Design a protein around this ligand. Structure first.
Ligand SMILES: *[C@@H]1O[C@H](CO)[C@@H](O)[C@H](O)[C@H]1NC(C)=O
Lengths: 49, 49
């Protein structure tokens, strides 16, 4: 009998890009919005995984 | 929502309820069956210390 060990899944992490960059900051958030969808796309990519 | 003639014929109030939040998040006036992340719950401070 032999043992074959294979990974199946990753920890289902999720990162809120706004909270990460501009946690609880109105002034930072307003500047972050100048980057358009960059923040949104990052949240979407991690959700998909 | 702007129709073919450029007239606004409908709208979603993104802060009315959780379904409207989902519609605005997905940039659609129709929401398909499923679970969607639309926001982030945060407890606010009540005192200044
Ligand atoms: C645009 O206007 C024309 C009348 O000039 C109307 O017949 C047509 O249905 C309108 N289109 C839309 C989407 O309402």
């Amino acid at each position: 009998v032999t043992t074959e060990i294979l990974p199946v899944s990753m920890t289902k992490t999720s990162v809120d890009c706004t909270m990460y960059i501009c946690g609880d900051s109105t002034e930072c958030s307003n500047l972050l919005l100048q980057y358009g969808s960059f923040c949104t796309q990052l949240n979407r990519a991690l959700t998909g995984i | 929502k702007y129709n073919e003639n450029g007239t606004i014929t409908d709208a979603v109030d993104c802060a009315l309820d959780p379904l409207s939040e989902t519609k605005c998040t997905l940039k659609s006036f129709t929401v398909e069956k499923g679970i969607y992340q639309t926001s982030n719950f945060r407890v606010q401070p009540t005192e200044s210390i």
